[PDB]
Swiss-Prot record:
The gene is GFP. Changing residue 19 to A: Increases fluorescence at warmer temperatures such as 37 degrees Celsius. In GFPmut 3; highly fluorescent mutant when excited at 488 nm. Coiled coil: none annotated. Gene3D superfamilies: Green fluorescent protein. This is Green fluorescent protein. Changing residue 96 to K: Increases fluorescence at warmer temperatures such as 37 degrees Celsius. In Esmerald; leads to brighter fluorescence. In VisGreen; leads to brighter fluorescence. One of its GO terms (biological process) is generation of precursor metabolites and energy.
Length: 224
């Protein structure tokens, strides 16, 4: 229970290896090509006129399960701002995720802005800078420029007692290592986040599954 920030602000932090890559783009799927050893995903998320999140996540297979293990540090949030003031609606819309190769890191960079709806009708922008670096030694795919199109619905579970968020998400790409072969069916997912925002410590644990054949993610997150 008891998340100190609005649940919608954690959605992007809480596994792009489940994106559906069209067959004419399979040569450009970095995320699956890094598996099973995985990749480190790092972001800076700048909430305009407010604070920022800095995240570092390890995304990898642990046996049969895709794991996303995250550390989040949030700083400089305004007490009466949209985030710590809890003025955000559950509703939000995102830009496409624009991906380019990162030649230094043998990985990718990505950039996109999330538009969070505010209770008063204003908008709270969240500007994402992203980099992913492979963990393993195996050959990874460095992609041509492209993007991911993301759709999300947020809900609750009537039988759940703890502070929580149910998420359903569909993501499609648009524009060797054999890692992609690990995604040919439904894959279980575990997400763990250790967070500090403005000094307030918290954790989130998530479980669900992903089906990259249709780009589907379904998970329930609880806070602790």
């Amino acid at each position: 229970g008891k998340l100190p920030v609005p649940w919608p602000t954690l959605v992007t932090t809480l596994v792009q290896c489940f994106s559906r890559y069209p067959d004419h783009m399979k040569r450009h799927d970095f995320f699956k090509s890094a598996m099973p050893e995985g990749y480190v995903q790092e972001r800076t998320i700048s909430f305009k006129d407010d604070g920022k999140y800095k995240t570092r996540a390890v995304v990898k297979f642990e046996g049969d399960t895709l794991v996303n293990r995250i550390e989040l540090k949030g700083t400089d949030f305004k007490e009466d701002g949209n985030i710590l003031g809890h003025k955000l609606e559950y509703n939000f819309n995102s830009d496409n995720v624009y991906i380019t190769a990162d030649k230094q890191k043998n990985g990718i960079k990505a950039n996109f802005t999330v538009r969070h709806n505010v209770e008063d009708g204003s908008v709270q922008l969240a500007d994402h800078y992203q980099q992913n670096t492979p963990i393993g030694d195996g050959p990874v795919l460095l992609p041509d420029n492209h993007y991911l199109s993301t759709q999300t619905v947020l809900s609750k579970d009537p039988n759940e007692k703890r502070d929580h968020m149910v998420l359903l998400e569909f993501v499609t790409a648009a524009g060797a290592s054999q890692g992609e072969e690990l995604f040919t069916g439904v894959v279980p997912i575990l997400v763990e986040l250790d967070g500090d925002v403005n000094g307030h410590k918290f954790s989130v644990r998530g479980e669900g599954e992903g089906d990259a054949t249709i780009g589907k993610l379904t998970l329930k997150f609880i806070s602790t």
